[PDB]
Amino acid sequence: KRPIRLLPWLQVVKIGGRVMDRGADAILPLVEELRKLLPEHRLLILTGAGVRARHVFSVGLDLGLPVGSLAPLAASEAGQNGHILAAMLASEGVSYVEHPTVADQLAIHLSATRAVVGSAFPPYHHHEFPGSRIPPHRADTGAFLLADAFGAAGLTIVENVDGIYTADPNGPDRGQARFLPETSATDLAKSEGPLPVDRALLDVMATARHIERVQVVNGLVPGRLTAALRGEHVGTLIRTGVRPA
Amino acid sequence: KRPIRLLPWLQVVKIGGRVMDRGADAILPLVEELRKLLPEHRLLILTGAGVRARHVFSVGLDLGLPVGSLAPLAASEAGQNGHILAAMLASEGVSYVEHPTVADQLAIHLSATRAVVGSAFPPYHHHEFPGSRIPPHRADTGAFLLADAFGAAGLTIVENVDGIYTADPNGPDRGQARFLPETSATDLAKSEGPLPVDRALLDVMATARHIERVQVVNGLVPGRLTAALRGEHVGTLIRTGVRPA
Amino acid sequence: KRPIRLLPWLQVVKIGGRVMDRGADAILPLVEELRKLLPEHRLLILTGAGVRARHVFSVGLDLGLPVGSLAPLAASEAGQNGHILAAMLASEGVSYVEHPTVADQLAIHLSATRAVVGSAFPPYHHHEFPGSRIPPHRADTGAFLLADAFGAAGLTIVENVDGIYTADPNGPDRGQARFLPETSATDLAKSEGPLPVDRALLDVMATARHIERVQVVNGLVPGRLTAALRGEHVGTLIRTGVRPA
Amino acid sequence: NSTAELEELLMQRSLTDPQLQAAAAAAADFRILPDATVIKIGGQSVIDRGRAAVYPLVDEIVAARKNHKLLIGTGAGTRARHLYSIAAGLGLPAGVLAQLGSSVADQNAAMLGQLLAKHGIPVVGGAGLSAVPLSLAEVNAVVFSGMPPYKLWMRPAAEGVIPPYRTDAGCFLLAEQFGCKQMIFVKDEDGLYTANPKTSKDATFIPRISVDEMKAKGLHDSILEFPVLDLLQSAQHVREVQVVNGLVPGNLTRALAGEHVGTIITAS
Amino acid sequence: NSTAELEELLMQRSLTDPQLQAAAAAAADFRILPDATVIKIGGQSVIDRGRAAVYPLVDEIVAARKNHKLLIGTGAGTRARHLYSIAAGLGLPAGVLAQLGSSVADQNAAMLGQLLAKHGIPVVGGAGLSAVPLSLAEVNAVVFSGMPPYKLWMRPAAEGVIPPYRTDAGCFLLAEQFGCKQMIFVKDEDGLYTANPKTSKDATFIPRISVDEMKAKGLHDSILEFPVLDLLQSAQHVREVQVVNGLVPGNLTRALAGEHVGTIITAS
Amino acid sequence: NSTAELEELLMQRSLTDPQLQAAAAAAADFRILPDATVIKIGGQSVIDRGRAAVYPLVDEIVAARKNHKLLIGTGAGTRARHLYSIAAGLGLPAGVLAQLGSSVADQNAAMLGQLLAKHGIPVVGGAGLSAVPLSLAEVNAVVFSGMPPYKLWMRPAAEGVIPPYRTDAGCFLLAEQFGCKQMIFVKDEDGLYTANPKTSKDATFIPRISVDEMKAKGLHDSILEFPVLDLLQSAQHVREVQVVNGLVPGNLTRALAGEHVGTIITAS
Ligand SMILES: Nc1ncnc2c1ncn2[C@@H]1O[C@H](COP(=O)(O)OP(=O)(O)OP(=O)(O)O)[C@@H](O)[C@H]1O
Ligand SMILES: Nc1ncnc2c1ncn2[C@@H]1O[C@H](COP(=O)(O)OP(=O)(O)OP(=O)(O)O)[C@@H](O)[C@H]1O
Ligand SMILES: Nc1ncnc2c1ncn2[C@@H]1O[C@H](COP(=O)(O)OP(=O)(O)OP(=O)(O)O)[C@@H](O)[C@H]1O
Ligand SMILES: Nc1ncnc2c1ncn2[C@@H]1O[C@H](COP(=O)(O)OP(=O)(O)OP(=O)(O)O)[C@@H](O)[C@H]1O
Ligand SMILES: Nc1ncnc2c1ncn2[C@@H]1O[C@H](COP(=O)(O)OP(=O)(O)OP(=O)(O)O)[C@@H](O)[C@H]1O
Ligand SMILES: Nc1ncnc2c1ncn2[C@@H]1O[C@H](COP(=O)(O)OP(=O)(O)OP(=O)(O)O)[C@@H](O)[C@H]1O
Ligand code: MOO
Ligand code: MOO
Ligand code: MOO
Ligand SMILES: [Mg+2]
Ligand SMILES: [Mg+2]
Numbered sequence A, B, C: 001k002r003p004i005r006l007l008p009w010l011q012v013v014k015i016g017g018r019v020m021d022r023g024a025d026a027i028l029p030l031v032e033e034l035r036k037l038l039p040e041h042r043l044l045i046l047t048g049a050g051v052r053a054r055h056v057f058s059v060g061l062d063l064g065l066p067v068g069s070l071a072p073l074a075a076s077e078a079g080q081n082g083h084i085l086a087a088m089l090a091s092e093g094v095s096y097v098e099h100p101t102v103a104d105q106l107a108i109h110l111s112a113t114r115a116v117v118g119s120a121f122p123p124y125h126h127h128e129f130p131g132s133r134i135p136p137h138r139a140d141t142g143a144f145l146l147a148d149a150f151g152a153a154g155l156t157i158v159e160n161v162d163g164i165y166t167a168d169p170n171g172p173d174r175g176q177a178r179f180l181p182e183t184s185a186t187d188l189a190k191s192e193g194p195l196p197v198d199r200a201l202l203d204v205m206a207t208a209r210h211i212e213r214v215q216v217v218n219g220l221v222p223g224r225l226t227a228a229l230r231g232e233h234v235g236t237l238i239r240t241g242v243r244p245a
Numbered sequence D, E, F: 001n002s003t004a005e006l007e008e009l010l011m012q013r014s015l016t017d018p019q020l021q022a023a024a025a026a027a028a029d030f031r032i033l034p035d036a037t038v039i040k041i042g043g044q045s046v047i048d049r050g051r052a053a054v055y056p057l058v059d060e061i062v063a064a065r066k067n068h069k070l071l072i073g074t075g076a077g078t079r080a081r082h083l084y085s086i087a088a089g090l091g092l093p094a095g096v097l098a099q100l101g102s103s104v105a106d107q108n109a110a111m112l113g114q115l116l117a118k119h120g121i122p123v124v125g126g127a128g129l130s131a132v133p134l135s136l137a138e139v140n141a142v143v144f145s146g147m148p149p150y151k152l153w154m155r156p157a158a159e160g161v162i163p164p165y166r167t168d169a170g171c172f173l174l175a176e177q178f179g180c181k182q183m184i185f186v187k188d189e190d191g192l193y194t195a196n197p198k199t200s201k202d203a204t205f206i207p208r209i210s211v212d213e214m215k216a217k218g219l220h221d222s223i224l225e226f227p228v229l230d231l232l233q234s235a236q237h238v239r240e241v242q243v244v245n246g247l248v249p250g251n252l253t254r255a256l257a258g259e260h261v262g263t264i265i266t267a268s
C-alpha cells in the first residue's frame, strides 16, 4: 500500500516570502509566536522567496536566461529569508540548515533542538521542468513534497492574506473576491485565475501519500498559526485527496 | 604506554551488507531490535557493502580498473545500506552521518541523539594498498579501525551466520564445517580457507590498542545482538591480543 | 540604536596558541578545568595559532608570499590546536566545528552539547587587509569579532602570562615591566611597544556594540579561567568603550 | 508587449497569474551551450555489460570529441534496481529511492571517467558547471551522472515508489535547459519497435515517430522513460531525440555525424 | 637585515613587536598573478539594468580576453539593498548583513557566467583558485563574486549595521593580494565629479586625483566605497585604480588598452 | 579462466576465498594515467628550507612540464613533527596524528601552488581528479598534498602513535593506483648510503638496490618511510622508485630525462 512515514511527529510550516518582505512589523510578531510554539511542536520551518525573486526573474528574463537558470536564482532568495528568520530565533537554539542536511540529517537536528529553518524551494536547479519561463516548482511545491515524503503530521502555509479567494483580494478584481473556507486540489486545478499558492502544488497534492489537508492562514494576524497547528479552522483548508482508513 | 580512549562509552555495531541484501524480512526484525537498544547504549552503527559491491567489482574488473578504483566504488554500496538503515530509524532521531562528520563531530552527534549510522568502509579510496585486485580494507577492517581508534567499549559484527566455522557453512564444503565458539586473530591468520570477515581485520587486530575481543553474531536471530552488547557469548569471540592490566 | 544580541547567553573563551605549544603539561590542567566548567556555562572555545604560525610565516616570507597568502596558512595552525583540544574533550561530548558551521549553525550545536571548539582566526583568507606583511586580523581579533557579533555574555582571553605589562615580561626589557590590572583599548592603542594581543583587536574594540570588557588571564594557573568566567578580577581587564544604559 | 509591462506584472501580480505567465513567455531565448550534444550512456544497457560494450564507446567518444562538444551522462542499471527492490519492500518513499539511484549513476560516471582520464576528459562530480564550460572549451567533453538532483523532493509517480524521473529525464532536462542542439540516448536496442523486441516474436522497427503517435499505440513507457515524452512535448530547445544501439560499432559516431540511425522521436 | 634575524624575531618576539614588523616588511615581494587585471561589474550600476547594459559588456569581455587575463568580479545591487533594509529594521548585526549580500553577488556571478559559458569562461564558485590559474591560462578569464568572505566576522563600520567592506573592497583586495597589474571598476558614471552628477546641476569631472585630495574635498564616500580609498593607500601592488562607465560602448575595451577613460584614483 | 567463472565466484563465494582472489588477479590491467610521473617535494628536506631550495625547483617544474606530465605531491615537515610531538605527549592515537599531518602537507601544497599559479598549474585541493585529467591535458602539471586520506582510519604502526603511512606512502600509492610510469622522491640527500650521511663519518653511496637487499642490511627505515618499501614489493604498476637530491640544480630535470641520478630502489 502506502509508503511508511519517516517523521510522523513532524510539523512543517511554510512562511511566505511576501510576509518576510514586510519587515520587522510582520517578522517580529511572527517570531514571537514561533518562540511560544517551540515547546508545543517539532517544527520544520521553510521560507519562501518573495519580491526579490521577482526582481531576479525580471533581470534574468531580460537576459534571456532559461527556466533552469531562474529556478536556483529564486531559490537563493528563499534561503536568505531562512537565514533572517533563523537569526531571530537563534537565542532559542534554532539555526538555518542546508538542503543536503534536511534530506539526510533532519532527525538528528530535531533531536538536538526544537526547530530548524530551511529553504522551501526544492533543489530542482538546472533540472527544472520546461514549459514555462517561470519556474513551476517553487516554495509551496517544495514544502509539500518534503512534508509528504516525510509523512509529517501536517503542513501549514503562512500567507499575507486570510486564504484563497475566488479572485485576487488585492488586484483589480478585488470587489468580486469571495473567500473560500474549504476547497480541494482538483477544484482549484480546474479554475483559471491566480492563486496564492503554486499551481504545481495542486499537481503534487493529487499524488500525495499522507498529507490529507493543508491550511492557508494569515500570518499577519497573531494566533492563527497557533490555532492552525492545532487543527482549528482559521483559514482555507485544501483537501489533497488522500483517504484515511 | 597506550593512547587515550576518545569515546570510552561508545558501542560500535557493524551490520553485514549481505544481511541488508535479504530485504525487509531481515531488516525489519533488526530495526525493531535496534530501536529497543537505543535507550541502553550509545551506538555507532556501521553498514557493510554486500552483493552490490560484488557486481561493481565484476564490472570494474572487466574494465581492468585498479584496486584503488574499486575500493570507493564498493564503499558507495556500504553508504547506501547506511541510508536505508538510517531511514528506518529516522522516527527515533537517527540519521546517516558522513565520514568527515564521523571523524571530527561524532561526540556532538551522539550528544544530540542516541545513535547515528555511518559507512563501515574506510576512506582509503584511491590510496588503497596494492597487492590484490580486491580491496583489502573493507567493512570489517574499517569498523574495527574506527572502534579501536576511538577506544570504544566494544565492536560487535552482525552477520548472516552464527559465527566463524572451520569451513564455509554455505559452500561446497558444508558438511565438514565445525563451529568455532572462540578463536584469536593470530589463529585465524594462520589458516587458509575463507572467513566471514576481512583478512585485513586480523592484521589490524594484531596491532590493536584497546579492543580486546570482537564477537561475530547472527543478526538473523533476534536477540543475539542484544545479548552480544551485554557481553553474553552467543557467537564467535575473536581475541585480538590486547592485555588488560 | 544597537543591534540585537543573537546568543546573549554565550560565553566565548580564546585559548592562546602558545599555551597549546607547551604540551600536555599545560593542556591537561586546562582540559580538566574546562571539563568542570561545562555544567556552568555555554562555551564557544576558540584556539589561536602559536609558534607553528611563526614557522609558516618564516617560510612564506622567505618565498615572498603576500599577506593574503600568509593569513590562511596561519589560520590552519589555529585549527590544528582546535582539533587537539576538541579531541581531549570528546568524551564530554565536545567536537571541533568548522567556520561555516560556527557562522550559521552554532545555536543548534550548543543545544546538542555544552561546548564546541573552533578556530579563533577569522576567514579573511586572501581578502586580508594590506599594509603589513604580517596578517593583522589574527586569533584575538577574530574571537572578539565573533563574540561581539553574537552579543555574547563575555570574551575571556587565556594567555601564558598574567596579563598585559608595560613591557614584555619575557623579553630583554623584563626588569622594567609593570603589570596593568586594568586598561582601555584606546589607552593601549596609543602605546608603542609589543602587546600580548593583536593591535587589530584594539581597533575592533573601538567599534564594539556589546562587549564592554575583555579579561586577559593566565591559563597556566588553574582556577583563573574559572574565576574570570564569573567576573572575578584575576588578570588584565580591557575596557572596550561600550556604555551600558 | 514590452519590458516595462513584464516588470510591472512581475511585481504586482502573482506568479500564477495567466497574464504574467503569458508576458514571461515572450522574453528572449538564450542558449547557454548551443553547440553541444548531450549523450546518455545506458547503465543496464551498456555499462553493466563490461568492456565488450564500454571499450568501443570510449573509442568513439575520444574520436568524436575532435569535432563535437559532448556532455556524457551515465545511467544506473541493475545495482539501482537492486536498491529499489530492497527499499520498496521496506515501504520507503520515492524521495529516498531517488537518492539511492543517484549513487549508482555516480558509480558509472566514475568508471567511465577513469577510462577517459588520460584523454583529459573529466567527471563533473564536484561543481555542476564552470567545470563544464572550461572542459568543453579545452577538451570538448565531460562525464556527469544522469540522475536528477531532486533527491527527497522527487516528484512521485501516480502509484508505486519507483522514481519516475531517472537518468533518461535527468540527461534530457540538462539538454533542454542548456539549449543544446542534440540529445542522443545510447541503449542496447536498434530503436523503437511496435512491441518489445526482447519478448516479442514479430515487432516492427519505427524509424521516426512523434510523441502523440506513440501514446496512440501504447508505446508510452517502452525504450524511454514515459515522463521524458511529456517533457519533450513541453521543451523549447530540444524538440526531438534520437535512440541508438550502443552495441553496434560506430553507431554513436555516425549519429553525431547527422546519420539517421535508430529512432528519432519528435515532440510534435 | 638578514633571513636569520627575521627568523629569530619571529620565534622570540610577539607579532605586535615593532622590530618584528619592520623586519617582515623587508621580505621579498612575489606577485601571484602579475599579468592579470581585476574588473568589477557593478551590480546596481550595470547588471540590474538587464541586457541593454550586460550584453555589450559580455561582447567586450569576449573580445578583450584575447589579449588580457581578466578576473571579473560582480557587484550586488538592489536585491542586496532590499535585504539590508529588511535586516537592519530587525536590528541584525553587520556580520549577518554580510552573508545576505554575498548571495546577491553570487546571483549576479551566475547570470554573467551563463552568458559567457559558451566561450569557455567559468564561474569561480566552487574552489577559490586553481580554478583560477587553470582557467586564466587556457581561457584567459574567470567570473567570481565580489563580496569578501568575512561573513559573520565582518569588520563593522563606526555606526550602522551596513557592511562597510562590500563588492568594491572585495574586488580590490583580491587584486592587491594577487599582485595584479590593474584594477578597473565598471560603474554607470563617467567617473568622479566634484559632486554627485545624478543629484547636482553643476558638477565638474575629475580625470585624475589622489586619495588625500579626495578626502580634502569631501569625496570620501562617493563613486567608490570609502574604505577602498584607505585600503588603496595601504596597498603595495595596486597603487591606483580606474573608474569607467560601463554603459558607454567599448569603454572597458579601451581601458584595458591603456586609454585614460574615466577617473584614475592614485594612492599618493 | 573466463569472465563467467569470475562472476560466479564473486557472487557465491566470500571475498576472502583464495580461489576468488586468484580469479580476480587474472583480470586485465588498465593504467589510468600511464604517461604521467609522480614527484614528491620533501617538506622538511626542501620546502622548509625556503626560497634557496624551492625557487630552483619551481624553475625545473616549469621547464620540465613542457615534455612531461607531472603529479607534484608535497611533504609535511617540521610543523608536522611539532604537531606529532604535542599530540603524542597527550596520548592521542595515530588516527588523530594523521589528520594533523594532512594540514601541514596542505600548507606546503598551497605555497608551492601559489608560486606556480601564473604558469597555469593548479592545486588539486578541491576535488581529487577531473581536476587532474583536465589540468594534465592542458597545463601538464598539478600540485597535491602527499598525505594519504586515511585520517582517523589510519593503520597504526606496531608501536607508537606516529602514523606509519605519511607523505612518502601517499605519493607512491597515488602513483601505483593511477598506473604512472615513474615515481621520484625529491629529498635533500644524494640518495641511499650504507649509513646516515648526516651522522656518519664513513658511509658509502648506493646507486641501485632492491628492497630485499635493503632489509638484509638494516636500511629499512632510512631515506624512505619503511612501509613504502613493503608497498613497493606488492605494487603491480610502479616496480621501482628513484630518490634524488632536490638541492642540486637540475637534478629533477635530469631525472625526468631518464638519467640515473640518485638511488634507484627496485621491488625485486
Ligand atoms: N485567488 C487568490 N486568493 C488569494 N490571494 C491571491 C489570489 N490570487 C492572487 N492572490 C495574491 O497573491 C498574494 C500572495 O503572493 P505570493 O503567494 O506570490 O507570495 P508568497 O507565497 O508570500 O511568496 P513565496 O511563494 O515566494 O513564499 C496575495 O497577497 C494575493 O494578493
Ligand atoms: N569460515 C567461515 N565461517 C563462516 N562463514 C563463512 C566462512 N567462509 C565463508 N563464509 C561465508 O561468508 C558469508 C558472509 O559473507 P560476507 O562476510 O562477504 O558478507 P557481509 O560481511 O555481510 O558483507 P560486508 O562484508 O560487505 O558487510 C557467510 O554467509 C558464509 O556463507
Ligand atoms: N606588553 C606585554 N604584556 C604582556 N606580554 C607581552 C607584552 N608584549 C609581549 N608580550 C609577550 O607575548 C607573549 C604572548 O605571545 P602571543 O600573544 O603571540 O601568543 P598567543 O596569543 O598564545 O598565540 P595566538 O595569538 O596565536 O593565540 C607573552 O608570553 C609575552 O612574553
Ligand atoms: N517498444 C520497445 N522498443 C525497444 N525497446 C523496448 C520497447 N519496450 C521496452 N523496451 C525495453 O526497454 C529497455 C530500456 O531500458 P534500459 O534499462 O536498458 O535503459 P537504460 O539506459 O539502461 O536505463 P538505466 O541506465 O536507468 O538502467 C530496453 O532494454 C528494451 O528491451
Ligand atoms: N562624486 C561622485 N561622482 C560620481 N558618482 C557618485 C558621486 N557620489 C556618489 N555617486 C554615486 O555613487 C554610485 C555608485 O554606487 P553603485 O551602487 O552604482 O555601485 P555598484 O558597483 O552598483 O555597487 P554594488 O555593485 O554593490 O551595487 C553611482 O551611481 C553614483 O550616482
Ligand atoms: N641511509 C640513509 N641514506 C640517506 N639518508 C638517510 C639514511 N638514513 C636516514 N636518512 C635521513 O632521512 C631523511 C629523510 O627524511 P625527510 O624528513 O628529509 O624526508 P621528507 O620528504 O622531508 O619527509 P616529510 O616531507 O614528511 O618531512 C634525510 O634527511 C636523511 O638525513
Ligand atoms: O554535522 Mo550534522 O551532519 O550537525 O548532524
Ligand atoms: O553541522 Mo555538525 O558539524 O550537525 O555537528
Ligand atoms: O548543520 Mo549541522 O549537520 O547542525 O550537525
Ligand atoms: Mg503564496
Ligand atoms: Mg562478513
Ligand SMILES: [Mg+2]
Residues within 6 Å of the ligand: C016, C140, C159, C196, C197, C198
Ligand atoms: Mg596573545
